[PDB]
Amino acid sequence: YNPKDFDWNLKHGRVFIIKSYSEDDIHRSIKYNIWCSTEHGNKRLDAAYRSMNGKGPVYLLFSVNGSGHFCGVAEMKSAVDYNTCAGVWSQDKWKGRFDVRWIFVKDVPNSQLRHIRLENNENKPVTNSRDTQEVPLEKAKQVLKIIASYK
């Protein structure tokens, strides 16, 4: 993980915040390369992945609720299958699955990112985002640069 020469200067693609309920979900996701969001979240991610048609990346910026930091970045690697076993995740009723590839696995404090605001979310700091909040590409570049470079 954690490449030294990640290209954060995106000219294509879409980027979303993922708010994880538990660090347990992060460990599971890293180990099995899958993720699951809420129904609404899964649908929003599915549409974005399919839209791209493989001609650009869908990035996911992960942060555990209440942690006050981001914990990594993954790329979405499949459409979602809604037809799955329940109880794979910390919210045990959740069904659905898509593949992810983890790129960054590292903790980056919200203090480093909080000055980036999302004009599509009433100009709120990116660090106050809810699950599956999409990020304007020009702001996503700034976040990816900080996460890549943070020591």
Curated annotation (Swiss-Prot):
<feature type="binding site">
    <location>
        <position position="89"/>
    </location>
    <ligand>
        <name>RNA</name>
    </ligand>
</feature>
<feature type="binding site">
    <location>
        <position position="65"/>
    </location>
    <ligand>
        <name>RNA</name>
    </ligand>
</feature>
<feature type="region of interest" description="Interaction with m6A-containing mRNAs">
    <location>
        <begin position="1"/>
        <end position="151"/>
    </location>
</feature>
<comment type="function">
    <text>Specifically recognizes and binds N6-methyladenosine (m6A)-containing RNAs, and regulates their stability. M6A is a modification present at internal sites of mRNAs and some non-coding RNAs and plays a role in mRNA stability and processing. Acts as a regulator of mRNA stability by promoting degradation of m6A-containing mRNAs via interaction with the CCR4-NOT and ribonuclease P/MRP complexes, depending on the context. The YTHDF paralogs (YTHDF1, YTHDF2 and YTHDF3) share m6A-containing mRNAs targets and act redundantly to mediate mRNA degradation and cellular differentiation.</text>
</comment>
<feature type="binding site">
    <location>
        <position position="94"/>
    </location>
    <ligand>
        <name>RNA</name>
    </ligand>
</feature>
<feature type="binding site">
    <location>
        <begin position="35"/>
        <end position="36"/>
    </location>
    <ligand>
        <name>RNA</name>
    </ligand>
</feature>
<comment type="function">
    <text>(Microbial infection) Promotes viral gene expression and replication of polyomavirus SV40: acts by binding to N6-methyladenosine (m6A)-containing viral RNAs.</text>
</comment>
<feature type="domain" description="YTH">
    <location>
        <begin position="13"/>
        <end position="147"/>
    </location>
</feature>
<feature type="binding site">
    <location>
        <begin position="19"/>
        <end position="21"/>
    </location>
    <ligand>
        <name>RNA</name>
    </ligand>
</feature>
<comment type="subunit">
    <text>Interacts with CNOT1; interaction is direct and promotes recruitment of the CCR4-NOT complex. Interacts with YTHDF3. Interacts with RIDA/HRSP12; interaction leads to recruitment of the ribonuclease P/MRP complex.</text>
</comment>
<protein>
    <recommendedName>
        <fullName>YTH domain-containing family protein 2</fullName>
    </recommendedName>
</protein>
<feature type="binding site">
    <location>
        <position position="25"/>
    </location>
    <ligand>
        <name>RNA</name>
    </ligand>
</feature>
<comment type="similarity">
    <text>Belongs to the YTHDF family. YTHDF2 subfamily.</text>
</comment>
